[PDB]
Amino acid sequence: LRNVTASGVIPQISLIMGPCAGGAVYSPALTDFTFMVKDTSYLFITGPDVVKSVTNEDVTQEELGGAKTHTTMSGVAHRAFENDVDALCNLRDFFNYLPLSSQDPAPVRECHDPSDRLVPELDTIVPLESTKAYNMVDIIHSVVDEREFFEIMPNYAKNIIVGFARMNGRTVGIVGNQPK
Amino acid sequence: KTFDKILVANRGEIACRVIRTCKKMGIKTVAIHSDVDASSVHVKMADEAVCVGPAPTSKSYLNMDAIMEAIKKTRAQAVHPGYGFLSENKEFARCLAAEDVVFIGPDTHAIQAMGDKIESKLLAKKAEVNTIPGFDGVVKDAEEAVRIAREIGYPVMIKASAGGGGKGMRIAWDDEETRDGFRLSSQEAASSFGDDRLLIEKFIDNPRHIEIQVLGDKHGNALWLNERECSIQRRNQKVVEEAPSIFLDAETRRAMGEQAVALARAVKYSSAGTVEFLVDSKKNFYFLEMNTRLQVEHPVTECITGLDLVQEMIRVAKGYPLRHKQADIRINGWAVECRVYAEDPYKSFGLPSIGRLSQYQEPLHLPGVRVDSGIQPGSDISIYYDPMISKLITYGSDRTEALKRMADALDNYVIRGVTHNIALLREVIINSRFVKGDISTKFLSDVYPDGFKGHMLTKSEKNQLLAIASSLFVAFQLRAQHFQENSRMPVIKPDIANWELSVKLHDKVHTVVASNNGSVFSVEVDGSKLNVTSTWNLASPLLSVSVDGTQRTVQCLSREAGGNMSIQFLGTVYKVNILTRLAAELNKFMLEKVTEDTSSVLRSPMPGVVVAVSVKPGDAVAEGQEICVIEAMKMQNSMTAGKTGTVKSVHCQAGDTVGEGDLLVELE
């Protein structure tokens, strides 16, 4: 009830740092972003013991609800990090993008990247031949402040790119296609 | 006065050089390009351009028939091919002259005259240069090997009458090992390729490669310019050259310059070209070869002679005499040139890389620096062409000023998107043997006997690198806290007086404590006190810092939240992982899991039909090299290699249909 009430009012971030079973597995479904730790965190309702007892299927803990499954195939986890220390370091960086509440404007931070510079690298990215793919990320990185881009679900639904970046100090969200 | 319109039959910086000179002269310049070079710099700089053909050069820059069509289509009067492609192609010059188009370069007589080694040696004998005699006969006896050497000279080489690759070769100096070398080769060589006839000739020790340039005149005149020292090379291609050698005094320069002219005036070489000499440790100069074409080492002599070689070649081709006399040619200072390639210097000294350029900034704000480049940001470098990026030329009043300015230009020279060879150039020019001049044509092979490893840091340099990396780390941490104030939710900046860091380099972990005093960070690195002062503009590709009075330029190439930073320091990229004290103390509890690097296994990223495979087993593969193309959904998905090597097996062929995850090619 609180997680639903807070939706659209305050950001809700849930980082999974270990196994999660039963009803607990639904709270990340109500928050805004879910992150995991590779080979350490799990998300499932029932364990492999129930799957084997109910149906004639063979599965292990990692296959059923491991971080790799949820960041690559089911689309449940927004990103997995290698270990606990790196996971929290990236979480601090992610935090700095978001406002404290929905009543606040997108945060604006000190920026040294001139807002009026040109990016000549863009003129030749897009081929004239219609059947030749190009990497959309090259455009995104060249436009955003200081070439910093935070990519969400890098391994899931690769044909569309979404993520956070700053332009002239202000946090923006970026959505685009990946022709590759 | 001069030509109204000149066509250039080349691409890249050499085409740019001609376009700039023509514009200075008021001459319209026509460019040619392939379909992939349509957006290259020389195409945009030229006044008119004609597309000739597709990406491979054999159909675009060596297609003389398509070029002839472009020459007449634009009503060009003269053609300047630069170097490389059709500069020595006689059939091109013949069919070009047949149409009364002025060719800028050698005529076909000079090209054929030096066509082979026999005519070149005969010219050196007639022009009277050197070409040291050998033995015009077969050595048969045990005493002939030494008796003949006694009549001609001292350093004597024994080699097979025909063959190579060590086919009984030995180097001898005195008579005892000359006799021994012959009899060994004459009795064992018969067991290799069935031939035991030995010849003797004369050799030199630690050679230096020295060029002298000559400017020919159609009226019979010819002048010689200052020499070039071209000893730093890999895979028989030069990378660094110096103009005002060091191995010559005033008399030697005149003596050798006159001989280079004697060659040019005896074949009537009314063009610009180069004569190559080898000099031994005793300052004995021997003829090596005569070249007919503007060399790639012509932008370093110009900085001390004050000439413009392209301007002069165009007037000579029009029919004007040389504008100078020999008494006016002198050394006005010193100039050194470095060639920058898109190559990995670690992989057997220069393995080509493939890629696109995302950041590019030439050091043109520094004194005494001239950058001659054919690329612009958003340029691609590919397997079809020699991976040249630029030629960096630095000049000064003395040898130390030109070298110091070169060192500065290399650290302020931004190339990102490809792998480059700046680390190699930055270390060679500062090598104690290079500064003193003890350089031979095999210099790099003795300095780096196990390959290129990168710049090696000493104690003080490690302390400066640690202090810079630690201060830059904190500078980002402080910038992260400066928000516009939100009147609803006050933000309180943490009062962090000291930053306690654990800074891991290669295999060592250092203890660093930093504090901020405004623009300067006071950093203690394992007990050593350093003060790093800067403006700390964190967006610029070039960050200028002063560490205890020492001026450094560094580049931060990448940053991660986990503390990983990639910092280029003195040309070499160092990997440093900066954790806070707390993160480093707890990180020891993490399991050191290691995964497999399966970069040799190239699988299809997308289902569809295979339309091209660029390889067969044994083919060389560069990083980023296209291997396979799979087409579906009206799109061609190019699959590239992530590993340098050769192909071991090609599993899917063109015409085959593959799914997602199927194996296409397997590398060694």
Ligand SMILES: CC(=O)SCCNC(=O)CCNC(=O)[C@H](O)C(C)(C)COP(=O)(O)OP(=O)(O)OC[C@H]1O[C@@H](n2cnc3c(N)ncnc32)[C@H](O)[C@@H]1OP(=O)(O)O
């Ligand atoms: C249908 C629903 O949605 S309701 C789901 C109900 N959920 C549960 O009760 C838990 C599910 N099953 C389990 O207990 C599993 O063991 C899981 C989910 C806890 C995962 O197991 P593991 O990660 O291996 O932890 P493990 O059970 O080995 O931990 C052992 C210790 O944890 C405690 N523990 C383990 N499971 C439970 C549990 N279900 N309830 C309370 N304590 C538990 C025990 O006290 C035990 O003590 P010990 O330290 O002496 O061993």
